[PDB]
Amino acid sequence: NKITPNLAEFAFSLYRQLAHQSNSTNIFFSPVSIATAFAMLSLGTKADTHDEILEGLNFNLTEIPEAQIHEGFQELLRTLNQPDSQLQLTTGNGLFLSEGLKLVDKFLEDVKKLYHSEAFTVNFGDTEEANKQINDYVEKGTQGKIVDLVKELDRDTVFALVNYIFFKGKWERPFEVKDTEEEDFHVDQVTTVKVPMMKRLGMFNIQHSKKLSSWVLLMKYLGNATAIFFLPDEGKLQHLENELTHDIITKFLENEDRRSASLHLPKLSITGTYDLKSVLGQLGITKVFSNGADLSGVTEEAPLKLSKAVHKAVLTIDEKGTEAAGAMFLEAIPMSIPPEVKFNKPFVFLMIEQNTKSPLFMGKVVNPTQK
Numbered sequence: 001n002k003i004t005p006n007l008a009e010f011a012f013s014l015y016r017q018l019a020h021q022s023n024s025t026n027i028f029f030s031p032v033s034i035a036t037a038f039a040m041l042s043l044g045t046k047a048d049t050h051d052e053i054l055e056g057l058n059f060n061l062t063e064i065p066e067a068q069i070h071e072g073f074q075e076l077l078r079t080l081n082q083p084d085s086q087l088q089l090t091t092g093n094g095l096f097l098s099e100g101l102k103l104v105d106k107f108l109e110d111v112k113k114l115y116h117s118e119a120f121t122v123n124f125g126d127t128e129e130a131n132k133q134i135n136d137y138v139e140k141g142t143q144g145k146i147v148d149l150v151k152e153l154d155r156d157t158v159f160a161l162v163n164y165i166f167f168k169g170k171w172e173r174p175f176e177v178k179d180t181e182e183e184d185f186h187v188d189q190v191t192t193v194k195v196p197m198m199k200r201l202g203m204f205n206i207q208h209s210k211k212l213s214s215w216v217l218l219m220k221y222l223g224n225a226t227a228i229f230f231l232p233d234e235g236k237l238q239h240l241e242n243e244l245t246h247d248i249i250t251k252f253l254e255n256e257d258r259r260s261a262s263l264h265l266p267k268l269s270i271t272g273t274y275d276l277k278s279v280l281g282q283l284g285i286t287k288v289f290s291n292g293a294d295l296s297g298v299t300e301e302a303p304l305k306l307s308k309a310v311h312k313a314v315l316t317i318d319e320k321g322t323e324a325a326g327a328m329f330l331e332a333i334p335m336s337i338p339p340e341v342k343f344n345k346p347f348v349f350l351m352i353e354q355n356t357k358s359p360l361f362m363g364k365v366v367n368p369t370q371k
Ligand SMILES: C[Si](C)(C)CCCS(=O)(=O)O
Pocket: 187, 191, 193, 367, 369, 370, 371
């Protein structure tokens, strides 16, 4: 897991930027899917264009050889696409290139073989039809969960990147639907809204952190992933966001102790849609989106730049995530008063791949029913 510390720093860099833009919008994105897509794209770039991308993903190119970077991403893709996988993770990356371009076979080989991604040729001379084919690809890739992703292409587009990911996990220890009820969610210190709130009494991997001034809950999904929820103390949301570090997360993941608690956790259906040209440009990735881009690994003779780049991530959290009966189990609950831990005010969360400890998702809920 040589690249996991880098992915974690990329997740935090990207989160802190998005959190700076607006503090009153839900956030949800996939550090892994974005980083994988641009590590892949770098295989078609050279010199400064190439270095900017990998440096913008938090790789210090004076310290880590590039071979270890791509080997880390490929080993990560190997775990996320295992056939027998209950994790049910739907992600894709689509490269849409002008059909008039003479493409380098090596790049198309690396895209398909090394990164198991998709590259298409489109007539960008028909802007509306190209837009439709881009949206149809995403819509088909998500069986209709993500529709009308790209809303506008500029006439001069010759190369577009769409990165999508949809996740609805199945809890190893699920909630009972009968126990879900409408509860208050404190959007601020004097204001509440009603939201569907799951609840369960059980033995949870839960603790209060003095360092983070937050409750920290870890819940495992069927498959190879764990959700980490951070509930900041009154007035500590910003402190929480500032103090998160990869080392702090690792310590939580290594703790397996469980304690009784009465957990209240909102059902969630949230999405995040980001213009990666804008967002990654704030992290230093600019030349690949500019006329000066060195994409000679993609096409040798003609100029090229990445004109459009979008990420959309969709999250569903509910009681079971499936209609099938799960494996039954019994937890031994002591008779002492369980703490009441209610995720009923803004909180942060992170989903981690158990094998690599990579950050599959990161987000913030400011209002579950915001839209
Ligand atoms: C939490 Si409240 C009802 C004062 C703002 C809701 C606006 S929106 O999310 O519907 O855009």
